[PDB]
Amino acid sequence: VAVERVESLAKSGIISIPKEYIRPKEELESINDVFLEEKKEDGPQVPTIDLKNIESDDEKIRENCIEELKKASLDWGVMHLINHGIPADLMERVKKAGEEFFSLSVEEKEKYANDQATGKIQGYGSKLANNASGQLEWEDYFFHLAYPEEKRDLSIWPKTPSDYIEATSEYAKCLRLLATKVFKALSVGLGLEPDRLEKEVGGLEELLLQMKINYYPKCPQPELALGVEAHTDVSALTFILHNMVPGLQLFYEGKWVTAKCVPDSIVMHIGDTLEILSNGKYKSILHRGLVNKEKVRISWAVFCEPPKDKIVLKPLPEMVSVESPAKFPPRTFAQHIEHKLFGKEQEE
Ligand SMILES: O=C1C[C@@H](c2ccc(O)cc2)Oc2cc(O)cc(O)c21
Ligand SMILES: O=C(O)CCC(=O)C(=O)O
Numbered sequence: 001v002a003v004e005r006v007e008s009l010a011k012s013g014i015i016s017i018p019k020e021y022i023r024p025k026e027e028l029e030s031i032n033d034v035f036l037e038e039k040k041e042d043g044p045q046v047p048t049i050d051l052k053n054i055e056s057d058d059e060k061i062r063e064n065c066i067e068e069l070k071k072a073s074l075d076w077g078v079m080h081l082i083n084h085g086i087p088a089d090l091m092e093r094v095k096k097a098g099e100e101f102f103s104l105s106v107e108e109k110e111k112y113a114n115d116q117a118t119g120k121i122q123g124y125g126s127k128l129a130n131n132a133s134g135q136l137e138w139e140d141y142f143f144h145l146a147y148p149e150e151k152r153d154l155s156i157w158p159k160t161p162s163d164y165i166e167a168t169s170e171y172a173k174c175l176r177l178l179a180t181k182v183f184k185a186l187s188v189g190l191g192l193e194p195d196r197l198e199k200e201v202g203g204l205e206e207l208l209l210q211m212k213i214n215y216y217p218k219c220p221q222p223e224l225a226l227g228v229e230a231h232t233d234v235s236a237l238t239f240i241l242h243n244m245v246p247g248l249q250l251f252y253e254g255k256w257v258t259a260k261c262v263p264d265s266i267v268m269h270i271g272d273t274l275e276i277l278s279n280g281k282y283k284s285i286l287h288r289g290l291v292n293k294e295k296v297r298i299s300w301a302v303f304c305e306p307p308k309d310k311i312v313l314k315p316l317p318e319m320v321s322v323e324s325p326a327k328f329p330p331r332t333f334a335q336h337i338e339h340k341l342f343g344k345e346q347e348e
């Protein structure tokens with residue numbers, strides 16, 4: 001076996017990328033210059049959602065917020081969050097600590113290398129081919145469980161930079177509170193009791209927050225490749241930071257919309273797990289990630305997910321009728337992931 005990193009391929013002095021990184025000729029049609037795509041204000045754009053009044057003591061103004069967030073969720077299922085209560089300073093500590101880890105040599109990152117053949121999923125990694133097409137994506141990553149503190153294996157966290165562990169686990173901490181509030185509003189928006197969605201996905205007890213730093217090296221032929229493939233997140237909610245480089249695209253009314261770079265904001269996705277519980281009301285949107293020649297892109301995605309086995313996920317009884325039956329049969333989290341894999345496995 002051989003290990004190989006996109007970061008290495010990027011610094012090897014290649015003018016054309018390998019065959020495995022080129023998208024199918026059908027998919028190449030839709031890939032354009034991310035920078036030009038960033039300069040278009042024509043057509044649908046991702047909503048920006050202001051969360052200032054999400055817990056507001058004036059019910060008139062709290063309710064307002066809940067409606068914008070609901071509408072945003074029913075429509076797009078993705079949005080830029082502003083005024084979300086996470087310190088701007090703390091967001092910078094996290095990005096700085098992640099930029100520093102990735103600026104170590106590959107050889108020093110390899111010390112944290114994951115090992116999927118032995119079930120070591122946490123760590124420094126790069127996505128291996130997983131069906132008959134050998135397709136790879138133009139990214140390396142760092143993945144670990146983040147919250148709750150008691151479930152973390154800190155021995156896989158970067159010790160250099162020194163501020164990595166503290167920054168990340170205060171961010172997670174802060175993210176869990178935000179998630180509680182979001183779940184609260186989503187719950188109300190749907191008409192349920194306010195605690196509901198959080199306990200259906202696991203509560204404080206069982207809900208997991210996974211951190212994945214997506215590291216997109218510069219790419220010499222960016223318009224042939226993807227950073228991350230077209231997919232929906234399996235999560236209940238995903239929160240994303242990035243280094244103000246464009247690349248996120250959303251598949252919205254039949255076309256690929258590019259996200260803009262809003263400073264001090266957080267991309268939040270509605271994920272499959274909420275879509276299932278809500279019977280398709282809230283949308284787990286399809287999305288992907290483009291690379292470029294000029295700039296390293298980095299994003300920090302935190303996936304708030306249920307326990308893999310323990311909770312049988314399915315549409316809520318409140319959320320089904322004769323007039324609108326269950327759109328999804330019951331599956332555990334792990335089963336849901338497998339059904340998706342199984343589906344995609346069918347190349348040939
Ligand atoms: O979209 C993904 C990527 C995935 C993942 C990446 C790397 C790895 O080594 C293992 C898993 O983790 C997740 C976990 C979530 O609940 C929800 C998600 O949507 C995802
Ligand atoms: O890097 C990004 O902005 C996209 C991240 C993404 O879709 C993922 O990590 O699941």
Ligand SMILES: [Fe+2]
Pocket residue numbers: 231232233287
């Ligand atoms: Fe995603």
